A paper describes a structure:
As such, we found that a circularly permuted variant of a cage-forming enzyme, [name] [name], cpAaLS, assembles into a variety of hollow spherical and cylindrical structures in response to changes in ionic strength. While the wild-type protein, AaLS-wt, self-assembles into a ∼ 16 nm dodecahedral structure composed of 60 identical monomers,35 the negatively supercharged variants AaLS-neg and AaLS-13 adopt expanded 360- and 720-mer assemblies, respectively, constructed entirely from pentameric capsomers. Moreover, a circularly permuted variant of AaLS, cpAaLS(119), forms not only ∼24 nm and ∼28 nm expanded spherical cages, but also straight ∼24 nm-wide tubes of variable length. We previously designed two circularly permuted variants of AaLS and confirmed that their morphologies depend on the positions of the newly generated N- and C-termini.
In 1 M NaCl, the tubes remained a 2% minority, while the ∼28 nm cage constituted ∼30% and the smaller ∼24 nm cages dominated at ∼59%. The 24 and 28 nm spherical cages are composed of 24- and 36-pentamers, respectively, and both have tetrahedral symmetry, resembling those formed by the previously engineered AaLS variants, NC-1 and AaLS-neg. In contrast, cpAaLS(119) assemblies are non-quasi-equivalent, where at least one interface of the pentameric subunits remains uncontacted. The bonding network observed at the 2-fold symmetry interface of AaLS-wt is approximately preserved for all the interacting pentamers in the cpAaLS(119) assemblies. In marked contrast, the (pseudo) 3-fold symmetrical interaction interface of cpAaLS(119) assemblies lacks cryoEM density corresponding to the N-terminal α-helix(120–131). This finding suggests that the α-helix is unable to form the native-like hydrophobic cluster, likely due to the disconnection of residues 119 and 120 for circular permutation.
Author numbering:
A (entry chain E): 12 to 162
B (entry chain A), D (entry chain G), E (entry chain M), F (entry chain L), G (entry chain B), H (entry chain HD), ...: 15 to 162
C (entry chain H): 10 to 162
Write the structure that this text describes.
Amino acid sequence: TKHGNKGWEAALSAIEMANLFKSLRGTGGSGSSMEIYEGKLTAEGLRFGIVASRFNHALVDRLVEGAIDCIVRHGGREEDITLVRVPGSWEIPVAAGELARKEDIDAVIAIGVLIRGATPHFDYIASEVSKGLANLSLELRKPITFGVITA
Amino acid sequence: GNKGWEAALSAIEMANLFKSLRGTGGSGSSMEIYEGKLTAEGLRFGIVASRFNHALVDRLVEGAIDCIVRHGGREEDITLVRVPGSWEIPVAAGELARKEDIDAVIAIGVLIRGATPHFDYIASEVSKGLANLSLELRKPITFGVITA
Amino acid sequence: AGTKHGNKGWEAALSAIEMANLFKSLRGTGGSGSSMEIYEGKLTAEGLRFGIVASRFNHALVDRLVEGAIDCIVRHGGREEDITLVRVPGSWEIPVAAGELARKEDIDAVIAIGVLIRGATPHFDYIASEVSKGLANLSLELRKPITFGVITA
Amino acid sequence: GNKGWEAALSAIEMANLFKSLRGTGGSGSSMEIYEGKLTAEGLRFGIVASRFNHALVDRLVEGAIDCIVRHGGREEDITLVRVPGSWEIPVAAGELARKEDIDAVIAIGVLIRGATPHFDYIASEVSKGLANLSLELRKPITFGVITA
Amino acid sequence: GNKGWEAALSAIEMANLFKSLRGTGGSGSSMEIYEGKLTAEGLRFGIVASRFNHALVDRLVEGAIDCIVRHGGREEDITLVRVPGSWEIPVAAGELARKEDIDAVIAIGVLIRGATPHFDYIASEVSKGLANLSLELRKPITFGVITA
Amino acid sequence: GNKGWEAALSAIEMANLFKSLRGTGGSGSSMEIYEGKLTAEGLRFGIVASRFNHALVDRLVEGAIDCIVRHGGREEDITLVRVPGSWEIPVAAGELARKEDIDAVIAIGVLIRGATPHFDYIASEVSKGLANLSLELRKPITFGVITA
Amino acid sequence: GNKGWEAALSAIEMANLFKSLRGTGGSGSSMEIYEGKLTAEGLRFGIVASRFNHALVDRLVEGAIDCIVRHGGREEDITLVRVPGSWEIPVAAGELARKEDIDAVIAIGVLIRGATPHFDYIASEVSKGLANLSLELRKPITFGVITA
Amino acid sequence: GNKGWEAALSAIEMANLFKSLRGTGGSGSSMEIYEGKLTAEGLRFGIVASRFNHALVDRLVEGAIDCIVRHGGREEDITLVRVPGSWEIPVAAGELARKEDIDAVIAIGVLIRGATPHFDYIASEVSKGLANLSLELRKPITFGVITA
Amino acid sequence: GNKGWEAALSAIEMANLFKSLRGTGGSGSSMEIYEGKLTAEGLRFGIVASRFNHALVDRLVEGAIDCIVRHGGREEDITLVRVPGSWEIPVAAGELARKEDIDAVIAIGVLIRGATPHFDYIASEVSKGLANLSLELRKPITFGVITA
């Protein structure tokens, strides 16, 4: 909305996708016209989960704060947020798969930082984060949002 | 002039082609050819569009509906789903392609070319997800994502 | 169409929602005491009504700002039937038209959008100064929030 | 054209706009857009101009008259008042605006920034005075003051 | 404004000028000067527009309709025709100009010249056809084409 | 794609536009809009194609026939005329256009401009002839001529 | 030669290899070697060919049919399916491969990589889909896709 | 044009020249001139065409057949023989030339000289063989071989 | 991959073509086409290979036999003749092509490119001799000589 940091933006997507899926599962329109499905930016009664890495905790800490501020401003509740910390970026996909299988959580947010300017070997690590997170959403049929910064 | 029109045209042809393959009847002793007509009467479509780049998607969505109506389709048979960004298109498409009333799905969006790893990785995953989903569910899904 | 963070039409609409909700809290029943009371606004737009005043100059820029403003209200819970739009020749006419809207008993906030070309030559530095003065004075006299979406190129 | 043509156009549109707000609202079920036409039939106007640099000022007053006539307004529905200098435009404009038979006012004038310091307090006060009139009386007043 | 706005004004002015020429005479005993006013009540119009993507010509058509309605015209008295491309405008313009209840015609299009042959030849023929039609049917036709 | 496909699409749409434009008009109560559908059921077509550049023109003619048949047309309702070169296209098009059982005409050919000023004069005359015929006979003639 | 001929040769040999590999094994007394003969008597084939680049793909399809017929195959035992573009090849190949009267599938098409990053993503997904289908269904699918 | 058309024109003229040259001579009283007419009514032809460069040679063969039929020949009086490559053209031409119901032979093919010295030797031997056969058998054989 | 395979494939086609030409039977009233199948059953071949370049010829001879066996031929029907150098191929080929049991002859060898008159003259004579011998004896002889 206004803050701009990728934690804020990543949380806006999660709030909208969580609302969209309830609309889809509910029912169709009255009829005699084109059906439209959209999600609104209201976080009243939604459960969220956040997975964040520890490498560069200075930058990650602000991003995790920004995502939490976004949820409360739009009507969320601080008690309906679960946070998990992992040693590094290689472990984000495996950790998020555990949250997604919970029957309560409705959306999942991944935050982290990637170093791709000093070592010509991290490219292997970076590519697997994007693949693993994307495959999980299709398999479990649950929205998972990308909040990964590159340094 | 726009990829929205092109994507909708492929969807019409693929929908008619799958009715011919899943059919039985008399045939001759010669070679057998299966083709798709461009008559949109009686078919039901689904569109999934992202909001990125503000108003450019609205231009693409307008072209898609124009193709369906002018080729014989009815505007009561379209379903529109809107998602926040390009990263969200595959998951929304899967939900829309798992219901028996839909015959084909069209994906529209705009991607960024900021020359950053953040966008380069997102771009690849959009294409791979839509490709796998059409093979898993055996339903045609058309690609209408442009850049800039 | 629409927009998100970056466009000045979206930020202005955000302030209006927060201010419109804040006033309803202030006029509400007082608290029970026993501690300090903190008043702040929620980003919910359900049941609110707005007005927008836009200038026709620089059709390319202004058009996308008006789309951003309308997009913000709808996404956050607004209803399309509860927005009134007014077009005017130029920036000099914005304050007078805004006053007509603010007096309606069924308008909770007002958003002003326009583009200023100050600095190039005279006849515009005078215009720019008075637009800021008029909108500010109207807000205090009428006691309704009035947001300032005017940009400069 | 000239700045006088532009000022008359704004007056015609604002005068029509105010006549719409005072009327009934739209049918509902959608956004209400209020805008002003450019028909000048049935409207009464007023012009206030200064003598200084009569060569330039006369051209501007001709432009305003041309614009109103071309758009379908009679010359019998125009009141013209002339004043010694720029300092007297706002007080002169106040008398016209209080009448119930005038629906818009146009100010024409020319100033000189490169003059003595005494002719600088005047320059800023013209803008302030006309602005406060419009909000006070709730009646459009248009600006047509240029500089040499 | 946009060239859809500019083109529509010339049709309002020229449609009024003709009604004066083929009617009653002037005062007499002196030179007769003719000119058209910018009123549009009672006039009938026709707009012919091409297709180029779905965005850049929609703006020019909306600018044209706004000019007529704000300057006094009725929406009941406008006919809009869409054609595949620039090459098809003159044949479509001919059909409208032959109708007894149309007073002027506005042509809006996009020429993408400067790219490849097959388009440096189309441009030269579009201007000639509209020019000939006006001199052959005695009905003004206004030119509203942009360059991509 | 190929200009054979594009030229047949334009012909199908103009043939439908002229049926509605020559029928009963709208009752009223709104602006009247005329558009052409992309359905080719019950329409007759003629094609004029040159012979030079043996390989190319055969591909263009196949494209045009494929477009008509896949939109609902019948191969029995197509007339094909072959001519030696581009210079001869306009004269043959006149004969087809003057028949009362043809709704539109498609012109295909290859211009070999690039040298030999003998061929620079031929290029300019093919466009002129086709444009005049369409206006004279009041029938749509589509341009499908490319440059090698 | 052309990849149409090469792709049909590979399909004929793999179809023969899978007949001997699924039959009775060797008695023993030596190393067992399995090879495919180049005889196409009694085998069924399917072909999936796109449409873009109208001229090229037609030459490739003729090459594939010529190879089969001249090796002993019958034109009555060939199935042909046409699709709009390269993006649609993998989905159609799945339907043909799941039939119980087809021994191998040949995929033909033209990729237009070279610009417009829209087409750079399509290129990588056609190979992935065809490779996975062959392993999943346990049927040989041959790659006959070239680049323009 | 194409060498297929040129090679068939030469064959038609030489076939007519050999009929008059083998008939009764002129009575006298002037110089005797023998010429060949361009009429192909009652003459038989044979064509030998290679296969390499799949697309090109098919266009050349169509040109040759079109020339004969449009000059009065019958498609029933044409014999066509296909060979793998250019190296094989002379040997097949000998078999056709030795039949007593053929008046001339047309040889078509594509030489792929440009690299691979393997193909530089083949080029020189095709011309030698065709030239010797014509002199040995006393029948006209026309050269229709191009270079890619 | 190697010219030994290519030379053997031409031999099979030419052998089958000469059985069709030297045949009689019923025929239709349409055009007559003679082609060669790629079935090697019942045919008898001859190979002439040189020893130069040590082991490279062994690779070429291996490819030739693989083609004949896999297309249906029997290894008891091949005759292999080995000569010291390329200069000796034509004389050995003539002896092998003069016996009635042989249907086609294949020539394989390697030439040197030392840029010397000794090798430049030898290279030319190998090609000319094999070309003449096929015309004298009316039997197909295939060229499979490579360089380096």
